[PDB]
Amino acid sequence: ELIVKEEVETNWDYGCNPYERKIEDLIKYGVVVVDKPRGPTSHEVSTWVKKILNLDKAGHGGTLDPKVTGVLPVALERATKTIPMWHIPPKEYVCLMHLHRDASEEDILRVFKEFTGRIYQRRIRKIHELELLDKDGKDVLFRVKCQSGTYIRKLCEDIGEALGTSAHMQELRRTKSGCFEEKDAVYLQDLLDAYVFWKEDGDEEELRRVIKPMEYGLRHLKKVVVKDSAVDAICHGADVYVRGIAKLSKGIGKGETVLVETLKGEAVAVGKALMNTKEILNADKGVAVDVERVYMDRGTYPRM
Amino acid sequence: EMRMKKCPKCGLYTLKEICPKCGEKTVIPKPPKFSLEDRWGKYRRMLKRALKNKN
Ligand SMILES: [K+]
Ligand SMILES: [K+]
Ligand SMILES: [Zn+2]
């Protein structure tokens, strides 16, 4: 829920609901969550997406190694500008680890607790959850929710050593990255077919099912919703002033990264909060957000 | 060599050949191999089209 600072109307002659974009614009500001195949590099995958949709630009998020499968968000065209925000939320993986010597289930559970929290790797990374999914002798299958940048291969080795033996990662599959989950993932074959269905059968249904608006990958950020009259200015480099805000998230703290959205829910840009939610609510003047990157094309909304 | 499995129904990950919470034979989570060649693409799309103007 957002706090309303000022009730304002939006002009439906400009922009639109992110999920109701014309097909070309959905692609322009879209993201395809690919279920990465075992074998190709993450770069080969973004390249394929680029070729499949006949795009000029595409980029993936958290790099997955060649043998790793799973959630691999691939930003399309303008959406590539949003990739830097994807590392913020935690990631999750299912991993198959092979111990050098068998260990009891009780000792594994104990060590998982020991690793739950802050750990060190070459950096301090946080391990939010570590769950034992299944075990068969030296083969241990576990789920891990962790901070971006955490090397799972190294985590398996350290867990092996903590058990009094050694271990190596056998298989890894990412189930969550950024705001995307496995349920959002699509096979490249289905993305290819979706495109063909649009280009041939003139049907956008499949493309709309597989391409998500970039706003979907920015849901973890607190928001500052601005009036229509402030949008184009922001797209041209202006910061967000108190008087241009219609609604905002509760608990925004100074220095916090926030998403600037239109009244229709379109991502305009991201920046650092210069004031907290209350100051913004009490102020009648001042600069609310120091804009750091613009996502929306100039001229989408009216210049004032 | 052990390989992780996943239940096609519950979507749970396990090492068992049969899900312990549902019943169906578990499957390998890996996505089908892909190539721009899209060898059987025509047939695959043929099926989707037919299946769609039906159920
Ligand atoms: K990512
Ligand atoms: K064993
Ligand atoms: Zn099941």
GROMACS .gro file of C-alpha atoms and ligand atoms in nm:
model
  362
    1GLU     CA    1   0.000   0.000   0.000
    2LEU     CA    2   0.113   0.352  -0.088
    3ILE     CA    3   0.049   0.677   0.098
    4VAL     CA    4  -0.139   0.937  -0.103
    5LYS     CA    5   0.020   1.282  -0.088
    6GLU     CA    6  -0.207   1.433  -0.350
    7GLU     CA    7  -0.489   1.278  -0.548
    8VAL     CA    8  -0.421   1.340  -0.917
    9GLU     CA    9  -0.563   1.226  -1.250
   10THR     CA   10  -0.352   1.075  -1.527
   11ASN     CA   11  -0.399   1.140  -1.898
   12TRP     CA   12  -0.456   0.815  -2.086
   13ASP     CA   13  -0.340   0.985  -2.405
   14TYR     CA   14   0.019   0.933  -2.289
   15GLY     CA   15   0.192   0.611  -2.190
   16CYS     CA   16  -0.022   0.323  -2.068
   17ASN     CA   17  -0.045   0.038  -1.821
   18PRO     CA   18   0.280  -0.159  -1.855
   19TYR     CA   19   0.084  -0.480  -1.915
   20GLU     CA   20  -0.126  -0.315  -2.186
   21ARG     CA   21   0.155  -0.189  -2.408
   22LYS     CA   22   0.135  -0.232  -2.783
   23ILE     CA   23   0.338  -0.542  -2.869
   24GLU     CA   24   0.637  -0.342  -2.999
   25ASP     CA   25   0.656  -0.143  -2.676
   26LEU     CA   26   0.614  -0.452  -2.461
   27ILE     CA   27   0.928  -0.580  -2.637
   28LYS     CA   28   1.092  -0.238  -2.614
   29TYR     CA   29   1.057  -0.242  -2.234
   30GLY     CA   30   1.042  -0.618  -2.186
   31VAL     CA   31   1.214  -0.904  -2.005
   32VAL     CA   32   1.216  -1.272  -2.093
   33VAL     CA   33   1.283  -1.507  -1.804
   34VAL     CA   34   1.462  -1.796  -1.976
   35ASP     CA   35   1.504  -2.138  -1.815
   36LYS     CA   36   1.871  -2.168  -1.912
   37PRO     CA   37   1.972  -2.498  -2.078
   38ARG     CA   38   2.271  -2.697  -1.955
   39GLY     CA   39   2.562  -2.643  -2.193
   40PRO     CA   40   2.551  -2.291  -2.341
   41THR     CA   41   2.698  -1.989  -2.163
   42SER     CA   42   2.468  -1.718  -2.032
   43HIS     CA   43   2.599  -1.491  -2.307
   44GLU     CA   44   2.505  -1.744  -2.578
   45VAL     CA   45   2.154  -1.746  -2.430
   46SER     CA   46   2.113  -1.367  -2.440
   47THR     CA   47   2.247  -1.379  -2.796
   48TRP     CA   48   1.987  -1.638  -2.892
   49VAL     CA   49   1.707  -1.431  -2.738
   50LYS     CA   50   1.838  -1.134  -2.933
   51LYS     CA   51   1.830  -1.331  -3.259
   52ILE     CA   52   1.495  -1.497  -3.190
   53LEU     CA   53   1.318  -1.164  -3.137
   54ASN     CA   54   1.526  -0.987  -3.403
   55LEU     CA   55   1.642  -0.728  -3.151
   56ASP     CA   56   1.934  -0.488  -3.158
   57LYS     CA   57   2.006  -0.516  -2.787
   58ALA     CA   58   1.957  -0.769  -2.507
   59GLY     CA   59   2.130  -0.851  -2.181
   60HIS     CA   60   2.107  -1.113  -1.909
   61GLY     CA   61   2.125  -1.069  -1.533
   62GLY     CA   62   2.313  -1.275  -1.276
   63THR     CA   63   2.548  -1.485  -1.487
   64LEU     CA   64   2.496  -1.861  -1.465
   65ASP     CA   65   2.782  -2.094  -1.554
   66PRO     CA   66   2.763  -2.323  -1.862
   67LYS     CA   67   2.648  -2.633  -1.674
   68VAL     CA   68   2.401  -2.449  -1.453
   69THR     CA   69   2.034  -2.432  -1.553
   70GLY     CA   70   1.737  -2.227  -1.439
   71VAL     CA   71   1.617  -1.870  -1.401
   72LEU     CA   72   1.807  -1.638  -1.633
   73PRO     CA   73   1.626  -1.305  -1.687
   74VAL     CA   74   1.715  -1.146  -2.021
   75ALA     CA   75   1.633  -0.776  -2.054
   76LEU     CA   76   1.526  -0.659  -2.400
   77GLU     CA   77   1.616  -0.324  -2.561
   78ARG     CA   78   1.550  -0.041  -2.313
   79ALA     CA   79   1.497  -0.288  -2.027
   80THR     CA   80   1.872  -0.351  -2.022
   81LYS     CA   81   1.896  -0.018  -1.838
   82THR     CA   82   1.720  -0.179  -1.539
   83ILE     CA   83   1.958  -0.477  -1.496
   84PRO     CA   84   2.164  -0.303  -1.223
   85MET     CA   85   1.859  -0.323  -0.989
   86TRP     CA   86   1.822  -0.700  -1.025
   87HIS     CA   87   2.105  -0.796  -0.787
   88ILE     CA   88   1.932  -0.637  -0.487
   89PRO     CA   89   1.689  -0.912  -0.392
   90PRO     CA   90   1.825  -1.252  -0.283
   91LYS     CA   91   1.876  -1.546  -0.517
   92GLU     CA   92   1.776  -1.909  -0.460
   93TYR     CA   93   1.919  -2.235  -0.596
   94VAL     CA   94   1.867  -2.608  -0.562
   95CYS     CA   95   2.207  -2.778  -0.544
   96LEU     CA   96   2.339  -3.134  -0.554
   97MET     CA   97   2.657  -3.168  -0.348
   98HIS     CA   98   2.871  -3.481  -0.332
   99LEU     CA   99   3.056  -3.544  -0.005
  100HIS     CA  100   3.391  -3.724  -0.022
  101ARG     CA  101   3.292  -3.930   0.283
  102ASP     CA  102   2.938  -3.996   0.410
  103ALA     CA  103   2.804  -3.780   0.695
  104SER     CA  104   2.501  -3.822   0.919
  105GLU     CA  105   2.187  -3.622   0.845
  106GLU     CA  106   2.213  -3.469   1.194
  107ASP     CA  107   2.564  -3.336   1.127
  108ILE     CA  108   2.457  -3.188   0.791
  109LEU     CA  109   2.160  -3.012   0.953
  110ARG     CA  110   2.386  -2.876   1.225
  111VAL     CA  111   2.637  -2.742   0.971
  112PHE     CA  112   2.357  -2.588   0.762
  113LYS     CA  113   2.264  -2.388   1.072
  114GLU     CA  114   2.627  -2.291   1.120
  115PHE     CA  115   2.636  -2.154   0.766
  116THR     CA  116   2.302  -1.977   0.796
  117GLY     CA  117   2.387  -1.608   0.825
  118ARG     CA  118   2.706  -1.420   0.735
  119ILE     CA  119   2.995  -1.606   0.571
  120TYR     CA  120   3.316  -1.518   0.385
  121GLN     CA  121   3.430  -1.591   0.027
  122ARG     CA  122   3.678  -1.462  -0.234
  123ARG     CA  123   3.368  -1.079   0.054
  124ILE     CA  124   3.101  -1.118   0.319
  125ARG     CA  125   2.782  -1.275   0.185
  126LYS     CA  126   2.459  -1.353   0.367
  127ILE     CA  127   2.302  -1.700   0.362
  128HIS     CA  128   1.936  -1.653   0.442
  129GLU     CA  129   1.816  -2.011   0.417
  130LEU     CA  130   1.982  -2.350   0.383
  131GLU     CA  131   1.739  -2.645   0.365
  132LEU     CA  132   1.814  -3.016   0.333
  133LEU     CA  133   1.584  -3.144   0.057
  134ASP     CA  134   1.707  -3.501   0.024
  135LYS     CA  135   2.005  -3.723   0.093
  136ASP     CA  136   2.136  -4.053  -0.040
  137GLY     CA  137   2.470  -4.152   0.103
  138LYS     CA  138   2.729  -3.892   0.006
  139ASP     CA  139   2.481  -3.718  -0.225
  140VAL     CA  140   2.314  -3.420  -0.057
  141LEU     CA  141   2.040  -3.217  -0.227
  142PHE     CA  142   1.972  -2.878  -0.069
  143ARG     CA  143   1.801  -2.547  -0.129
  144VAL     CA  144   1.989  -2.227  -0.058
  145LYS     CA  145   1.859  -1.868  -0.052
  146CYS     CA  146   2.148  -1.622  -0.054
  147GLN     CA  147   2.281  -1.277  -0.136
  148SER     CA  148   2.380  -1.210  -0.498
  149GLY     CA  149   2.748  -1.276  -0.564
  150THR     CA  150   2.758  -1.580  -0.336
  151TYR     CA  151   2.953  -1.861  -0.504
  152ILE     CA  152   2.759  -2.183  -0.454
  153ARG     CA  153   3.051  -2.398  -0.568
  154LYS     CA  154   3.264  -2.251  -0.287
  155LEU     CA  155   2.977  -2.287  -0.038
  156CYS     CA  156   2.967  -2.661  -0.112
  157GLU     CA  157   3.341  -2.691  -0.051
  158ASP     CA  158   3.329  -2.508   0.281
  159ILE     CA  159   3.033  -2.715   0.396
  160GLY     CA  160   3.231  -3.028   0.311
  161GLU     CA  161   3.524  -2.906   0.518
  162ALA     CA  162   3.292  -2.806   0.805
  163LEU     CA  163   3.173  -3.168   0.809
  164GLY     CA  164   3.527  -3.298   0.853
  165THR     CA  165   3.566  -3.412   0.494
  166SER     CA  166   3.543  -3.238   0.157
  167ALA     CA  167   3.274  -3.191  -0.106
  168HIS     CA  168   3.213  -3.066  -0.456
  169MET     CA  169   2.913  -2.925  -0.636
  170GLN     CA  170   2.768  -3.180  -0.879
  171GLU     CA  171   2.465  -2.989  -1.010
  172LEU     CA  172   2.314  -2.644  -0.966
  173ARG     CA  173   1.982  -2.493  -1.078
  174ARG     CA  174   1.871  -2.138  -1.003
  175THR     CA  175   1.508  -2.112  -0.895
  176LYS     CA  176   1.493  -1.741  -0.816
  177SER     CA  177   1.684  -1.434  -0.930
  178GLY     CA  178   1.579  -1.077  -0.864
  179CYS     CA  179   1.198  -1.063  -0.868
  180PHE     CA  180   1.179  -1.360  -1.104
  181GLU     CA  181   1.096  -1.719  -1.008
  182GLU     CA  182   1.097  -2.056  -1.183
  183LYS     CA  183   0.724  -2.016  -1.248
  184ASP     CA  184   0.815  -1.720  -1.473
  185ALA     CA  185   1.076  -1.912  -1.674
  186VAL     CA  186   1.019  -2.013  -2.036
  187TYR     CA  187   1.205  -2.247  -2.272
  188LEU     CA  188   1.378  -2.081  -2.567
  189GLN     CA  189   1.173  -2.307  -2.797
  190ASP     CA  190   0.850  -2.158  -2.658
  191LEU     CA  191   0.985  -1.803  -2.694
  192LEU     CA  192   1.077  -1.882  -3.054
  193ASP     CA  193   0.731  -2.023  -3.125
  194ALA     CA  194   0.565  -1.722  -2.961
  195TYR     CA  195   0.753  -1.496  -3.201
  196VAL     CA  196   0.659  -1.707  -3.502
  197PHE     CA  197   0.294  -1.710  -3.392
  198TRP     CA  198   0.302  -1.331  -3.384
  199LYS     CA  199   0.485  -1.282  -3.713
  200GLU     CA  200   0.281  -1.546  -3.900
  201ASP     CA  201  -0.052  -1.609  -3.728
  202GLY     CA  202  -0.052  -1.244  -3.622
  203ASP     CA  203  -0.129  -1.361  -3.269
  204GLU     CA  204   0.033  -1.175  -2.976
  205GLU     CA  205  -0.107  -1.406  -2.706
  206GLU     CA  206   0.202  -1.625  -2.664
  207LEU     CA  207   0.448  -1.335  -2.682
  208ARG     CA  208   0.246  -1.155  -2.414
  209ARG     CA  209   0.258  -1.465  -2.197
  210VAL     CA  210   0.636  -1.506  -2.223
  211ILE     CA  211   0.755  -1.144  -2.224
  212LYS     CA  212   0.712  -0.960  -1.897
  213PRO     CA  213   0.723  -0.581  -1.863
  214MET     CA  214   1.048  -0.461  -1.706
  215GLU     CA  215   0.836  -0.321  -1.421
  216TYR     CA  216   0.797  -0.684  -1.310
  217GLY     CA  217   1.169  -0.698  -1.230
  218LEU     CA  218   1.156  -0.379  -1.019
  219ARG     CA  219   0.880  -0.472  -0.772
  220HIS     CA  220   1.128  -0.500  -0.482
  221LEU     CA  221   1.189  -0.124  -0.477
  222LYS     CA  222   1.001   0.134  -0.270
  223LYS     CA  223   0.812   0.374  -0.499
  224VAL     CA  224   0.760   0.744  -0.558
  225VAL     CA  225   0.464   0.792  -0.794
  226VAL     CA  226   0.476   1.122  -0.981
  227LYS     CA  227   0.220   1.340  -1.161
  228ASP     CA  228   0.202   1.332  -1.542
  229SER     CA  229   0.339   1.688  -1.557
  230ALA     CA  230   0.665   1.577  -1.396
  231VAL     CA  231   0.743   1.274  -1.615
  232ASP     CA  232   0.899   1.420  -1.930
  233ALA     CA  233   1.109   1.658  -1.721
  234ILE     CA  234   1.248   1.361  -1.528
  235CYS     CA  235   1.312   1.179  -1.855
  236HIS     CA  236   1.526   1.478  -1.956
  237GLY     CA  237   1.737   1.471  -1.640
  238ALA     CA  238   1.531   1.660  -1.383
  239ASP     CA  239   1.522   1.532  -1.025
  240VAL     CA  240   1.194   1.457  -0.846
  241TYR     CA  241   1.057   1.753  -0.651
  242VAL     CA  242   0.816   1.729  -0.358
  243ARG     CA  243   0.541   1.905  -0.555
  244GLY     CA  244   0.563   1.646  -0.833
  245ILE     CA  245   0.476   1.353  -0.607
  246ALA     CA  246   0.123   1.205  -0.597
  247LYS     CA  247   0.191   0.888  -0.396
  248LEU     CA  248   0.484   0.711  -0.230
  249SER     CA  249   0.575   0.402  -0.029
  250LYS     CA  250   0.576   0.408   0.350
  251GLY     CA  251   0.915   0.386   0.518
  252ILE     CA  252   1.130   0.544   0.248
  253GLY     CA  253   1.454   0.644   0.416
  254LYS     CA  254   1.706   0.907   0.311
  255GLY     CA  255   1.968   0.760   0.079
  256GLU     CA  256   1.745   0.466  -0.011
  257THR     CA  257   1.717   0.361  -0.376
  258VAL     CA  258   1.363   0.417  -0.502
  259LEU     CA  259   1.173   0.363  -0.825
  260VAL     CA  260   1.006   0.664  -0.984
  261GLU     CA  261   0.677   0.552  -1.150
  262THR     CA  262   0.398   0.720  -1.343
  263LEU     CA  263   0.039   0.709  -1.223
  264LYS     CA  264  -0.013   0.419  -1.466
  265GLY     CA  265   0.259   0.210  -1.302
  266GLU     CA  266   0.526   0.267  -1.568
  267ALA     CA  267   0.886   0.270  -1.447
  268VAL     CA  268   1.029   0.615  -1.521
  269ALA     CA  269   1.366   0.599  -1.344
  270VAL     CA  270   1.552   0.513  -1.024
  271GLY     CA  271   1.735   0.733  -0.778
  272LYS     CA  272   1.825   0.802  -0.416
  273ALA     CA  273   1.570   0.935  -0.169
  274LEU     CA  274   1.680   1.274  -0.035
  275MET     CA  275   1.393   1.285   0.215
  276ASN     CA  276   1.206   1.020   0.413
  277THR     CA  277   0.837   0.944   0.356
  278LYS     CA  278   0.721   1.178   0.634
  279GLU     CA  279   0.939   1.474   0.533
  280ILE     CA  280   0.800   1.435   0.180
  281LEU     CA  281   0.446   1.423   0.319
  282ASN     CA  282   0.502   1.733   0.534
  283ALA     CA  283   0.703   1.936   0.282
  284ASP     CA  284   0.553   2.182   0.033
  285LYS     CA  285   0.880   2.234  -0.153
  286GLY     CA  286   1.217   2.068  -0.201
  287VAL     CA  287   1.386   1.793  -0.401
  288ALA     CA  288   1.260   1.448  -0.304
  289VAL     CA  289   1.468   1.218  -0.523
  290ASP     CA  290   1.812   1.246  -0.679
  291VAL     CA  291   1.756   1.062  -1.009
  292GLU     CA  292   2.042   0.834  -1.111
  293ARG     CA  293   1.918   0.652  -1.424
  294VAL     CA  294   1.626   0.718  -1.657
  295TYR     CA  295   1.434   0.417  -1.798
  296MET     CA  296   1.160   0.585  -2.003
  297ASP     CA  297   1.218   0.739  -2.349
  298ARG     CA  298   1.195   1.118  -2.372
  299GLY     CA  299   0.871   1.237  -2.528
  300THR     CA  300   0.660   0.954  -2.387
  301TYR     CA  301   0.483   1.208  -2.168
  302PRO     CA  302   0.408   1.578  -2.246
  303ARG     CA  303   0.684   1.837  -2.210
  304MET     CA  304   0.560   2.120  -1.986
  305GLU     CA  305   2.625  -4.064  -1.076
  306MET     CA  306   2.325  -3.916  -0.896
  307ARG     CA  307   2.117  -3.646  -1.063
  308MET     CA  308   1.860  -3.414  -0.909
  309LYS     CA  309   1.497  -3.481  -0.996
  310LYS     CA  310   1.180  -3.277  -0.975
  311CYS     CA  311   0.818  -3.381  -0.938
  312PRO     CA  312   0.621  -3.279  -1.252
  313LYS     CA  313   0.314  -3.230  -1.032
  314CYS     CA  314   0.414  -3.076  -0.699
  315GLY     CA  315   0.726  -2.911  -0.841
  316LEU     CA  316   0.933  -3.038  -0.551
  317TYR     CA  317   1.303  -3.127  -0.585
  318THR     CA  318   1.430  -3.468  -0.477
  319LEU     CA  319   1.676  -3.747  -0.550
  320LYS     CA  320   1.399  -4.009  -0.554
  321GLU     CA  321   1.266  -4.163  -0.875
  322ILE     CA  322   0.914  -4.131  -0.734
  323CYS     CA  323   0.786  -3.823  -0.553
  324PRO     CA  324   0.738  -3.875  -0.176
  325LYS     CA  325   0.458  -3.618  -0.152
  326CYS     CA  326   0.252  -3.694  -0.466
  327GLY     CA  327   0.325  -4.005  -0.667
  328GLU     CA  328   0.429  -3.938  -1.026
  329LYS     CA  329   0.769  -4.051  -1.154
  330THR     CA  330   1.003  -3.756  -1.108
  331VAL     CA  331   1.185  -3.604  -1.406
  332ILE     CA  332   1.517  -3.439  -1.486
  333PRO     CA  333   1.476  -3.059  -1.441
  334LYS     CA  334   1.697  -2.970  -1.742
  335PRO     CA  335   1.537  -2.768  -2.025
  336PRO     CA  336   1.535  -2.938  -2.369
  337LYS     CA  337   1.852  -2.874  -2.572
  338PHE     CA  338   1.817  -2.572  -2.802
  339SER     CA  339   1.962  -2.464  -3.137
  340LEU     CA  340   1.867  -2.181  -3.373
  341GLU     CA  341   1.824  -2.460  -3.627
  342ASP     CA  342   1.494  -2.534  -3.451
  343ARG     CA  343   1.486  -2.874  -3.623
  344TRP     CA  344   1.135  -2.989  -3.525
  345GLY     CA  345   0.995  -2.637  -3.482
  346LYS     CA  346   0.745  -2.675  -3.765
  347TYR     CA  347   0.596  -2.992  -3.614
  348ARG     CA  348   0.593  -2.847  -3.261
  349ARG     CA  349   0.411  -2.534  -3.375
  350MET     CA  350   0.176  -2.743  -3.590
  351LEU     CA  351   0.067  -2.924  -3.275
  352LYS     CA  352   0.020  -2.609  -3.068
  353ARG     CA  353  -0.199  -2.457  -3.340
  354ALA     CA  354  -0.417  -2.765  -3.369
  355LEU     CA  355  -0.440  -2.817  -2.993
  356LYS     CA  356  -0.548  -2.453  -2.956
  357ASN     CA  357  -0.843  -2.440  -3.196
  358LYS     CA  358  -0.972  -2.734  -2.989
  359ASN     CA  359  -0.928  -2.743  -2.612
  360K        K  360   1.916  -1.173  -1.250
  361K        K  361   2.717  -4.261  -0.149
  362ZN      ZN  362   0.493  -3.453  -0.608
   0.00000   0.00000   0.00000
